[PDB]
């Protein structure tokens, strides 16, 4: 169908963007850019976004029971991981910005590293638990419940990041996260009426379009501005400018 | 297939024992790092196989239960993946050991190409990609589908054996001939018996037998490879020392003849 | 042997001494003036546009 | 004893020289250049990565045209690079693989190299047949060759580990002049822009300014505390900078006859292998044993930037004659060009 | 400039005692590992003792162990060598040497016939 | 149009240069370079002469290139330089091994050899290079021990309480005093190697087997072991 063809082309573009951003983040991995913007976690989030784009593929076609059953968990599992990584970055920014130094000296040294890995693992595990519970119990309720964790994660990131002090002699590490959360929120708020209004045949197409637009917004808001200066203008990658 | 049935609980407890053993080995290797034993065993490669074995053991209860498309997909999605990755990892390590101890001067340019093109990290990627491809083309169409996977795994094990064959006299920490023989013969006999039993059987409770065979294989290529190492590095701390490795490699290389 | 070496060292020390010594302030001023005069012709100091290599 | 009297006379002469230097130091370079605005954060990038060498690179020298350069490695090769195109022009095999120095003639006609063979071999680049062949085998040094610089197509000054320098007449292959006075292995050598003078830093923590024509040591500078590995004349010719194992660069002035400024940092403890000024003399690039080359403010002693990227110890450094770029070679058989 | 001046040598009856000093100037004392060398008549320069920058690591030769003691004081930039139970073959010129480079464990060319970082030496003679 | 032709000629010349360079690298990476160090009385000259006579091969360097079991070798002894070596010893920071030769029968200058070995071992640049220790002149050591005129305890006070190690080879017709002195000297040299080696490099002591080909075999075996361990470390397996 033409709609599936267009959404396949959009998926190809989004996956190409994810792969290019991942290549940049794994080649310039020792540069201050990715080090301040996560590190291994940034590459993990890029992998998760690519996996979300991949899971977009399983919506159309003949509705096999397993495929239709596993549509949503596969959609949120990687999105949950990437959103939690972005939330970790937002929490670090908010702790360094709007907290007394007494609490900051302990929070900053613990929110990065193995404890951050445990936090992302806990987010993924709670997503897995919710997904299996709703798969065994539920054969606006299902997707709302599966969406609640991502909604809270994104809202926390947006609340902790959207207001911040951006000194002219530093890098605004909050604009990208704010616009990523904004793109997620507005694209999904527009998605819901399209879910409730579009003809019943194109409902899966609306779902994959919403997921692809969410991934593209997150990319172009958070990762693409980083890659721009990571590839074209390497004159701003100084440690005194980022850390 | 019932949850309360003697073969099923027996297999479940065997899988739980394997999971505990693998977790203990992982903790032991993490605690005792920057030591010659773990570096000679493969370094991060050993951790990769250990966590992949952990996930294979964790998804064992998924195998047991009412029939489901998810469990059926996982059947060839995870356990054959575990077998192929673990055996290819062992074969790559054996090739590295043999090429370091020998054929480094016999085939100099080949080793330079192997080490300049990231060979250890390239052969593994080729193997996993090829196995994913053959798996999907297999599920596109019990005995015939599993025959290709068993042939691939037997070929990999035979390659590992043929590469470790000249390494009978290699030092004890770099020699895995006994493990390779045991694991290859166990996989071969288990696969042969299973393939024979698929046709001439009632058709029910054969899932128990197949899962039992797979967990025995997982326990084999886990214990037979990691148990001796942990035994040596906890019960013989003196045997785990860079000076000991230096002296023992030297004693191998310049023999009194 | 060593006597001749000491004699030659003493002669070299005499030669090194008894020479003019311009004040450190004047030498520093001259160095600063040279650095400032040629500042426009330093590609490493002033970033040359990418057109001119 | 006469030796005691000679030692007392030498001590008195040293005291008089030190007193004259102290009376001559009415201020400091930092006390004077305090009012000038500091150089902005200096950021160079690796434009070219010349690769093809086998063993560690030990020396390099830019050409007068600022496009071709020569480098010497310890595998026994002399590769001449076209820096603009990264192409290789020549690759001269050497009789002895232990080579510590290389030089480029000002006319671009010849190159020189030397090392543990105690011989300064000179190769004719632009010959009739187009094949690079050795033209003169300068012998006479009893120690390893550490540095060589061409006065012109027929003269070359070489410093050696036998604590003596020399000026060679290439046509006759004989030592026109010998510069003695160092008590340690001479490690570096820098010609003045007017070519009438040069300086040499040896392993006795002293740098001596020599006269080419008269063959005598005019001045001696003893501000360092360890073996001096590098030396480079200021573009004005009235000053120079030195590098030493004591992890300090020091700027000396010829007219003031004393040290002007030190370039040291608390976190820098590794030795210095190569130094070179910028075209205007405002910057002082210096390679280190920590695989990094630090850019120093020659007037304020502020570390402006760092040239990181070399996997092994930086061993040679050189700024083009037009100041367009700086080429650093190190022990991982890689040459890099920055600007 | 790097300068080391030794003192304390002189006539000592066999079985006597002595103490040597090395006033070091021109370099930071606490950054270099120090050394003591001797040169008996008709013999080459022979290493005697060394001491680490902080004084933690100390080693001597076999012929002087149990008789000679090496110590340093970074406050006064001096190096000591207390010599006990002197024997006639200890008659030698004692030089106070310094490692060529700072922050370096090994010491090179300490006993070379010519070495910039070495003092003039003090003659120690033992005779009854 | 001239620029195109000039660039094409430059690319062709660079291609030729790179082909020759890779041909040279194929031989350079297959050749083992060994640096010979010692004293005046150590006996490096006899080792060089024997190794050149056994396998035909070959100023300021006593270079010698030969081939042993189709393996290229390169033994060089740095003579003709001054007594100061802290600067030219940095050239041999990439050699395969250092063949240090000691005169075991010279107790007077044994401490100088020990100090030289300590300086070589602890050098910043010579910190990843294994040392093949050659304890030369064993017959003279045996004669000196049996004579009894000169005692090791005179120069080394720690020899009074020294005892022969359990892992000592009892060569036929060996006096206990001779083997005690041999192994005391060997252990004195090995303590320095084991005090700060930390597994980066190793020491291979070898009492010379009179005048026999076994020394060449020991050198070959030590080089082979060094290459094997280097391959293991590069593969991450050691």
HEC readout, A150-188 = HHHHHHHHHHHHCCCCCCCCCCCCCHHHHHHHHHHHHHH
Neighbours of D262 (CB within 10 A): 14
Tokens of E31: 């950054």
Evaluate whether D109 touches D123 at the Cβ level (below 8 Å): no
Nearest-angstrom CA–CA distance, F227 and B104: 9
CA pseudo-torsion sign D160, D164, D168, D173? negative
Nearest-angstrom CA–CA distance, D257 and D239: 9
Token look-up 């590794």 returns D270
3-state secondary structure of D46: strand
Number of structural domains found in chain D = 1
Q: Which residue of F has its CA nearest to E49?
A: F115
Number of B–F residue contacts, CB under 8 Å: 64
Nearest-angstrom CA–CA distance, A94 and A88: 10
Tokens of F159: 């020899």
Domains assigned to chain A: 2-242 (1.20.1070.10)
CB-CB neighbors (< 8 A) of C11 in chain D: none
Query: Under an 8 A CB cutoff, do D279 and C17 touch?
Result: no
CA distance C32 to chain D (A): 7
Residue F222 C-beta-side C-alpha neighbours within 13 Å? 26
C43 touches chain D (CB under 8 A): yes
Evaluate whether D252 touches D258 at the Cβ level (below 8 Å): yes
List the subunits that have 3+ CB pairs under 8 angstroms with C: D
Neighbours of A2 (CB within 10 A): 7
Nearest-angstrom CA–CA distance, F148 and F70: 47
3-state secondary structure of D338: strand
F156 touches chain E (CB under 8 A): yes
Nearest-angstrom CA–CA distance, A185 and F167: 76
CA D286, chain centre distance (Å) = 11
Does chain D reach chain E with at least 3 CB pairs under 8 Å?
yes
Tokens of E28: 């930071």
Number of C–D residue contacts, CB under 8 Å: 147
Between the alpha carbon of residue D5 and those of residues C4, C8, D137, E2, E116, the distances in Å are 13, 14, 45, 21, 21
CB-CB neighbors (< 8 A) of B70 in chain A: 66, 69-70
Tokens of A84: 């939690």
* D160-165 contacts at long range (C-beta below 8 A, 24 or more positions apart): D160/D118, D160/D185, D160/D186, D161/D185, D161/D186, D161/F81, D161/F82, D161/F84, D161/F87, D161/F88, D162/F82, D163/D202, D163/F82, D165/D189, D165/D200, D165/D210
Nearest-angstrom CA–CA distance, B101 and F233: 12
Q: Which of D336, D229, D307, D235 is nearest to D275 (CA)?
A: D229
CA distance A151 to chain D (A): 43
Nearest-angstrom CA–CA distance, E68 and A200: 99
CA distance E96 to chain F (A): 17
Token look-up 């920071």 returns F93
Q: Which residue of E has its CA nearest to F86?
A: E108
Three state DSSP letters for chain F: CHHHHHHHHHHHHHHHHHHHHHHHHHHHCCEEEEEEECCCCCCHHHHHHHHHHHCCCCCCCCCEEEECCCCEEEEEECCCCCCCCCCHHHHHCCCCEEEEEEECCCCCCHHHHHHHHHHHHCCCCCCCCEEEEEEECHHHHHHHHHHCCCCHHHHCHHHCCCCCCCCCCCCCCCCHHHHHHHHHHHHHHHHHHHHHCCCCCCEEEEECCCCCCHHHHHHHHHHHHHHHHHHHHHCCCC
Nearest-angstrom CA–CA distance, F232 and A140: 60
D55 touches chain F (CB under 8 A): yes
F89 touches chain E (CB under 8 A): yes
Question: In DSSP terms, which residues pair with F97 in a beta bridge?
Answer: F34, F130
E111 touches chain F (CB under 8 A): yes
Nearest-angstrom CA–CA distance, F134 and F51: 14
Nearest-angstrom CA–CA distance, F175 and F142: 8
Mutate to test the interface with D, among F10, F14, F72 (most CBs of D within 10 A): F14
- Using CB atoms, which residue from F204, F229, F236 is nearest to B43? F236
For helices A65-97 and A40-55, give the axis angle rounded to 10 degrees.
150
Evaluate whether B205 touches B8 at the Cβ level (below 8 Å): no
CA pseudo-torsion sign A235, A237, A239, A242? positive
Query: Which are the contacts of E79, defined by CB distance < 8 A and separation ≥ 6?
Result: E21, E22, E24, E34, E36, E51, E70, E71, E72, E96
Nearest-angstrom CA–CA distance, B115 and B100: 11
CA distance F208 to chain B (A): 16
Q: Which residue of B has its CA nearest to A135?
A: B70
Residue D41 parent element (H or E) = none
Nearest-angstrom CA–CA distance, E71 and E34: 10
CATH of the domain at C36: 4.10.260.10
CB-CB neighbors (< 8 A) of A235 in chain D: 43, 45
- Listing DSSP states for B44-93 in one string gives HHHHHHHHHHHHHHHTHHHHSSS--HHHHHHHHHTHHHHHHHHHHHHHHH
Length of chain A (residues): 243
Evaluate whether D57 touches D301 at the Cβ level (below 8 Å): no
Tokens of B106: 């016999």
* F211-215 contacts at long range (C-beta below 8 A, 24 or more positions apart): F211/F50, F213/F54, F215/F47, F215/F50, F215/F134
Which residues of C1-53 form beta strands (DSSP E)? none
Q: Which of D203, D210, D194 is nearest to D158 (CA)?
A: D210
Tokens of B1: 């297939």
- Using CB atoms, which residue from E100, E114, E120 is nearest to D227? E100
Query: Which are the contacts of B189, defined by CB distance < 8 A and separation ≥ 6?
Result: none
Query: Under an 8 A CB cutoff, do A238 and D45 touch?
Result: no
B69 touches chain A (CB under 8 A): yes
Query: Which are the contacts of E99, defined by CB distance < 8 A and separation ≥ 6?
Result: E32, E33, E34, E35, E106, E107, E108, E110, E117
Neighbours of F207 (CB within 10 A): 21
What region does B55 belong to: left with phi over 0, alpha with psi -120 to 50, or beta?
alpha
CA distance D255 to chain C (A): 6
Helices (H), D180-228: none
Q: Is D149 exposed, middle or buried (0-12, 13-18, 19+ CB in 10 A)?
A: buried
CB-CB neighbors (< 8 A) of C21 in chain D: 20-21, 24, 255-257
Cα D242–Cα D245–Cα D250 angle in degrees, nearest 5: 25
Domains assigned to chain B: 6-253 (1.20.1070)
3-state secondary structure of D121: strand
Tokens of D318: 């050189």
Question: In DSSP terms, which residues pair with C7 in a beta bridge?
Answer: none
For helices A142-161 and A114-137, give the axis angle rounded to 10 degrees.
160
Q: Is D145 exposed, middle or buried (0-12, 13-18, 19+ CB in 10 A)?
A: buried
Any idea what DSSP says for residue D186? B
Evaluate whether E99 touches E36 at the Cβ level (below 8 Å): no
* D68-72 contacts at long range (C-beta below 8 A, 24 or more positions apart): D68/D104, D68/D108, D69/D104, D69/D318, D69/D327, D69/D335, D70/D102, D70/D103, D70/D104, D70/D111, D71/D102, D71/D316, D71/D329, D71/D335, D72/D99, D72/D100, D72/D101, D72/D102, D72/D113
Length of chain E (residues): 128
CB-CB neighbors (< 8 A) of D43 in chain A: 235, 238
B67 touches chain A (CB under 8 A): no
Nearest-angstrom CA–CA distance, F81 and F62: 12
CB-CB neighbors (< 8 A) of C20 in chain D: 255
Query: Which are the contacts of D280, defined by CB distance < 8 A and separation ≥ 6?
Result: C34, C35, C38, C39, C41, C42, C45, D235, D323
Q: Between β-strands E122-126 and E11-12, what pairing exists: parallel, antiparallel or unpaired?
A: parallel
> C43: domain range?
3-53
Tokens of D236: 């004005």
Evaluate whether D223 touches D244 at the Cβ level (below 8 Å): no
Query: Which are the contacts of E56, defined by CB distance < 8 A and separation ≥ 6?
Result: none
Query: Which are the contacts of D161, defined by CB distance < 8 A and separation ≥ 6?
Result: D143, D144, D145, D146, D185, D186, F81, F82, F84, F87, F88
b/e map of D158-181 (b: 16 or more CB within 10 Å)? bbbbbbbbbbbebeeeebebebeb
For helices A101-111 and A65-97, give the axis angle rounded to 10 degrees.
140
Neighbours of B213 (CB within 10 A): 18
Residue B190 C-beta-side C-alpha neighbours within 13 Å? 21
Nearest-angstrom CA–CA distance, D125 and D109: 6
Query: Under an 8 A CB cutoff, do C24 and D220 touch?
Result: no
Length of chain C (residues): 53
Three state DSSP letters for E40-72: CCCCCCEEEEEECCCCCCEEECCCCCCCEEEEE
Nearest-angstrom CA–CA distance, A143 and A75: 10
Query: Which are the contacts of B139, defined by CB distance < 8 A and separation ≥ 6?
Result: B73, B76, B145
Q: Which residue of F has its CA nearest to E112?
A: F83
CA pseudo-torsion sign A97, A101, A102, A107? positive
Query: Under an 8 A CB cutoff, do F202 and B250 touch?
Result: yes
Between the alpha carbon of residue E43 and those of residues B63, E93, F43, F181, the distances in Å are 86, 11, 21, 26
For helices A175-197 and A203-218, give the axis angle rounded to 10 degrees.
170
Q: Is A195 exposed, middle or buried (0-12, 13-18, 19+ CB in 10 A)?
A: middle
Evaluate whether E23 touches E12 at the Cβ level (below 8 Å): no
Number of structural domains found in chain C = 1
CB-CB neighbors (< 8 A) of B242 in chain F: 198-199
Nearest-angstrom CA–CA distance, D73 and D253: 33
Q: Between β-strands D77-82 and D87-93, what pairing exists: parallel, antiparallel or unpaired?
A: antiparallel
Query: Which are the contacts of D98, defined by CB distance < 8 A and separation ≥ 6?
Result: D74, D115, D116, D117, D144, F61, F91
Nearest-angstrom CA–CA distance, F43 and F136: 7
List the subunits that have 3+ CB pairs under 8 angstroms with E: D, F
CATH of the domain at D273: 2.130.10.10
> D35: domain range?
1-339
CB-CB neighbors (< 8 A) of F85 in chain E: 108-109
Token look-up 């084991």 returns F194
Nearest-angstrom CA–CA distance, D326 and D318: 6
F40 touches chain E (CB under 8 A): no
């Amino acid at each position: 169908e033409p709609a599936v063809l267009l959404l396949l082309l959009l998926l190809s573009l989004a996956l190409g963007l994810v792969l290019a951003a991942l290549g940049l983040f794994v080649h310039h991995r020792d540069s201050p850019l990715v080090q301040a913007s996560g590190g291994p976690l940034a590459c993990f989030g890029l992998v998760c976004l690519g996996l979300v784009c991949l899971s977009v593929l399983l919506f159309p076609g003949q509705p096999s029971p397993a495929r239709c059953l596993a549509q949503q968990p596969l959609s949120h599992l990687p999105l949950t991981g990437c959103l939690s990584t972005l939330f970790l970055q937002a929490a670090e920014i908010f702790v360094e910005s709007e907290l007394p130094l007494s609490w900051a000296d302990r929070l900053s040294g613990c929110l990065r590293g193995p404890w951050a890995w445990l936090v992302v693992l806990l987010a993924m595990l709670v997503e897995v638990a919710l997904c299996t519970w709703y798969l065994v119990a539920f054969p606006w309720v299902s997707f709302g419940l599966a969406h609640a964790t991502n909604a809270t994660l994104a809202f926390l990131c947006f609340l902790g990041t959207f207001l911040v002090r951006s000194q002219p002699g530093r890098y605004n590490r909050a604009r990208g996260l704010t616009f990523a959360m904004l793109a997620y929120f507005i694209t999904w708020v527009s998605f819901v009426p399209l879910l409730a209004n579009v003809q019943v045949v194109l409902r899966p197409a609306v779902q994959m379009g919403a997921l692809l637009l969410c991934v593209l917004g997150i990319l172009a808001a958070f990762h693409l501005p980083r890659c721009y200066l990571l590839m074209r203008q390497p004159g701003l990658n100084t440690p005194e400018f980022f850390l | 297939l019932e949850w309360h049935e003697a073969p099923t609980i027996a297999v479940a407890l065997l899988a739980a024992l394997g999971f505990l053993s693998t977790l203990a080995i992982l903790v032991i290797f993490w605690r005792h790092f920057q030591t010659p034993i773990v570096r000679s065993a493969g370094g991060p490669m050993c951790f990769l196989m250990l966590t992949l074995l952990l996930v294979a053991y964790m998804v064992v209860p998924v195998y047991v239960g009412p029939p489901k498309v998810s469990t059926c997909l996982c059947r060839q999605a995870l356990f054959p993946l575990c077998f192929t990755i673990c055996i290819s990892c062992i074969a790559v390590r054996s090739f590295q050991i043999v090429c370091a101890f020998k054929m480094a001067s016999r085939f100099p340019r080949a080793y330079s190409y192997w080490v300049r093109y990231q060979g250890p990290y390239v052969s593994m990627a080729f193997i996993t990609v090829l196995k994913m491809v053959i798996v999907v083309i297999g599920m596109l169409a019990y005995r015939n589908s599993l025959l290709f996977n068993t042939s691939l795994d037997l070929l990999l094990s035979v390659v590992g054996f043929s590469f470790a064959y000249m390494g009978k006299e290699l030092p004890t920490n770099y020699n895995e001939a006994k493990f390779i023989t045991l694991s290859m013969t166990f996989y071969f006999t288990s696969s042969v018996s299973l393939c024979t039993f698929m046709s001439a059987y009632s058709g029910v409770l054969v899932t128990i037998v197949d899962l039992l065979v797979t967990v025995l294989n997982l326990l084999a290529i886990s214990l037979g490879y990691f148990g001796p190492k942990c035994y040596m590095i906890l019960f013989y701390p003196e045997r785990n020392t860079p000076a000991y490795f230096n002296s023992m490699i030297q004693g191998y290389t310049m023999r009194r003849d | 042997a060593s006597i001749a070496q000491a004699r030659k060292l003493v002669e070299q020390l005499k030669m090194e001494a008894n020479i003019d010594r311009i004040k450190v302030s004047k030498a520093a001023a001259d160095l600063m003036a040279y650095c400032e005069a040629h500042a426009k012709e330093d590609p490493l100091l002033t970033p040359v546009p990418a057109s001119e290599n | 004893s006469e030796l005691d009297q000679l030692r007392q006379e030498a001590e008195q002469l040293k005291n008089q020289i030190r007193d004259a230097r102290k009376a001559c130091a009415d201020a400091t370079l930092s006390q004077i250049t305090n009012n000038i605005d500091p150089v902005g954060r200096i950021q160079m990038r690796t434009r070219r990565t010349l690769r093809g060498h086998l063993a560690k690179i030990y020396a390099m020298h830019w050409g007068t045209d600022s496009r071709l350069l020569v480098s010497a490695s310890q595998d026994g090769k002399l590769i001449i690079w076209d820096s603009y195109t990264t192409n290789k022009v020549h690759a001269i095999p050497l009789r002895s693989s232990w080579v510590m120095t290389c030089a480029y003639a000002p006319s671009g006609n010849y190159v020189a190299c030397g090392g543990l063979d105690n011989i300064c071999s000179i190769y004719n680049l632009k010959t009739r047949e187009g094949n690079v062949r050795v033209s003169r085998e300068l012998a006479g040094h009893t120690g390893y060759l550490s540095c060589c610089r061409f006065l012109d197509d027929n003269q070359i000054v070489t410093s050696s580990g036998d604590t003596t320098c020399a000026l060679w007449d290439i046509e006759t292959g004989q030592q026109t002049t010998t510069f003695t006075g160092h008590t340690g292995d001479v490690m570096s050598l820098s010609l003045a822009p007017d070519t009438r003078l040069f300086v040499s830093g040896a392993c006795d923590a002293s740098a001596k300014l020599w006269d080419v024509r008269e063959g005598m040591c005019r001045q001696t500078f003893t501000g360092h505390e360890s073996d001096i590995n590098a030396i480079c004349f200021f573009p004005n010719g009235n000053a120079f900078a030195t590098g030493s194992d004591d992890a300090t660069c020091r700027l000396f002035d010829l007219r003031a006859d004393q040290e002007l400024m030190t370039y040291s940092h608390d976190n820098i403890i590794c030795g210095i292998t190569s130094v070179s000024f910028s075209k205007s003399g405002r910057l002082l690039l210096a390679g280190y044993d920590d695989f990094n080359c630090n850019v120093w403010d020659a007037l304020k002693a502020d570390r402006a930037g760092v040239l990181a990227g070399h996997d092994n110890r930086v061993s040679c450094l050189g700024v083009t004659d037009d100041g367009m770029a700086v080429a650093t070679g190190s022990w991982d058989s890689f040459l890099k060009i920055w600007n | 400039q790097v300068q080391l001046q030794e003192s304390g040598g002189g006539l000592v009856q066999p079985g006597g005692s002595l103490r040597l000093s090395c006033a070091a100037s021109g370099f930071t004392f606490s950054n270099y590992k120090m050394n003591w060398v001797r040169q008996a008549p008709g013999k080459g320069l022979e290493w005697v003792s060394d001491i680490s920058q902080s004084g933690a690591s100390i080693s001597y030769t076999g012929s002087v162990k149990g008789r000679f003691t090496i110590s340093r004081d970074n406050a006064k930039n001096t190096l000591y060598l207390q010599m006990n139970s002197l024997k006639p073959e200890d008659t030698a010129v004692y030089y106070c040497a310094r490692c060529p480079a700072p922050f370096t464990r090994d010491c090179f060319d300490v006993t070379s016939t010519t070495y910039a970082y070495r003092g003039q030496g003090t003659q120690v003679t033992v005779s009854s």
